[PDB]
Design a protein around this ligand. Structure first.
Ligand SMILES: Cc1cc2nc3c(=O)[nH]c(=O)nc-3n(C[C@H](O)[C@H](O)[C@H](O)COP(=O)(O)OP(=O)(O)OC[C@H]3O[C@@H](n4cnc5c(N)ncnc54)[C@H](O)[C@@H]3O)c2cc1C
Length: 383
């Protein structure tokens, strides 16, 4: 049986599920309300500067999953790229994550790894036996000066919450690296597609059994034309926000163009609340194999996600997870639909994880066909 599949969204979730089913002879119809493919991973070349701009913010590919790595290399030339982040705070510029250079610069010292371990131990606040809060966890781990420099201002700005209002769970481990490695991510596989994520997704979408329609919102009535629907849009939006909006932090990007080199790196964090933007990204630095005279940059601002704002980071506190449960109790009673992705399942997901889940979702659907089994509404736990 060649099934008729409707996929809502042409980001990694919809494209990867689409391709897997298309290759098994299914007739896949992919719609997206936006005027372009790629979802939040979409990139485009700026006309004036020819800079490849990460349209919805910096997207760095990283993974320990060799299957996903092999998958993306089939659809893009992946360029070696190891993301390195700088942070401006206290009138100084530091490397992030906190490492031996950070500590030595911060305290004007010359510590070895072992001396730094001892400096950190004696800086840590050993007054609260069992930290319940994120502020006290941070204080226990790294002490006041480091918590206030790198953690407090950034949490307030990024989450709109005092670290005193967050659980100790947020920080399980001492957030210090006791050497001079300054790679931001620890994953085995790290890289940037040579021609960008959009070209990568276009190659994933490049199959005769995939039809793509852009500038087209999903309409609930449509469901009946298909054997199954894969929905990578917001779970709450699917239900008309009938119980209210699931809480997100939204981002605004102020775009500007500089002649030359604005900041000399891809990402600069601004950890103080005295600075209204969280970070500035200089896109050209994501493509070191290219040279550009003009430079497109983003000042990034974080705020509470309102009406018609694009959702970015899911808050997922006790109130949001409770509201979620109301949507899930509807969702789990639906037939012939699977909710997927960052929006469909209300979770922050990396590109590699998204692709991993999409490949599994398709495998689960395909299995449900062979032995005639009922497709689950979720192929991951969402609670
Ligand atoms: C600011 C930010 C930075 C990130 N940085 C990284 C990073 O550095 N590295 C990394 O690995 N990951 C990063 N991510 C995560 C990455 O963006 C996600 O993994 C990816 O977007 C997941 O893709 P998706 O297809 O599931 O969802 P999306 O990309 O959001 O796709 C959803 C698509 O569905 C469409 N859609 C929604 N509703 C409807 C509807 N009703 N009708 C028709 N179409 C609809 C939308 O237009 C959109 O194209 C970042 C995410 C954000 C938000």
């Amino acid at each position: 049986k060649s099934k008729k599949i409707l996929i809502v969204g042409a980001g990694f979730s919809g494209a990867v599920i689409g391709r897997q089913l298309a290759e098994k002879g299914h007739q896949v119809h992919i719609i997206d309300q936006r005027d372009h493919i790629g979802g939040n991973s979409y990139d485009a070349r700026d006309s004036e500067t020819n800079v490849m701009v990460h349209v919805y913010g910096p997207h760095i590919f990283h993974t320990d999953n060799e299957t996903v790595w092999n998958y993306v290399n089939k659809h893009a030339e992946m360029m070696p790229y190891v993301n390195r982040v700088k942070a401006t705070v206290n009138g100084q510029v530091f490397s992030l994550p906190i490492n031996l250079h950070t500590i030595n610069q911060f305290f004007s010292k010359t510590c070895s790894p072992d001396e730094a371990r001892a400096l950190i131990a004696e800086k840590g606040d050993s007054t609260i036996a069992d930290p319940q809060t994120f502020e006290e966890e941070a204080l226990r781990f790294i002490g006041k000066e480091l918590y206030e420099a790198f953690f407090k201002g950034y949490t307030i700005k990024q989450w709109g919450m005092q670290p005193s209002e967050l659980p100790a769970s947020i920080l399980k481990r001492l957030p210090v690296r006791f050497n001079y490695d300054d790679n931001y991510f620890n994953h085995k596989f790290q890289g940037m597609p040579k021609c960008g994520y959009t070209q990568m997704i276009k190659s994933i979408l490049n199959h005769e059994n995939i039809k793509v329609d852009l500038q087209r919102e999903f309409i609930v009535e449509e469901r009946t034309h298909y054997d199954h629907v894969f929905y990578s849009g917001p779970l709450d939006a699917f239900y008309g926000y009938q119980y209210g909006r699931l809480g997100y932090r939204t981002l605004d990007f102020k775009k500007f163009t500089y002649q030359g080199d604005y900041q000399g790196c891809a990402v600069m964090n601004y950890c103080s609340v005295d600075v209204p933007y969280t970070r500035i990204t200089e896109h050209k630095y994501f493509s070191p194999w290219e040279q550009h005279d003009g430079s497109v940059c983003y000042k990034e601002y974080s705020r509470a996600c309102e009406e018609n704002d694009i959702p970015y980071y899911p808050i997922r506190q006790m109130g949001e997870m409770a509201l979620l449960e109301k949507y899930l109790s509807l969702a789990e009673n639906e037939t012939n639909i699977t909710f997927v992705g960052r929006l469909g399942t209300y979770r922050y997901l990396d590109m590699d994880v998204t692709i991993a889940e999409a490949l599994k979702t398709a495998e689960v659907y395909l299995n449900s066909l062979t032995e005639n089994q009922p497709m689950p509404v979720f192929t991951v736990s969402v609670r």
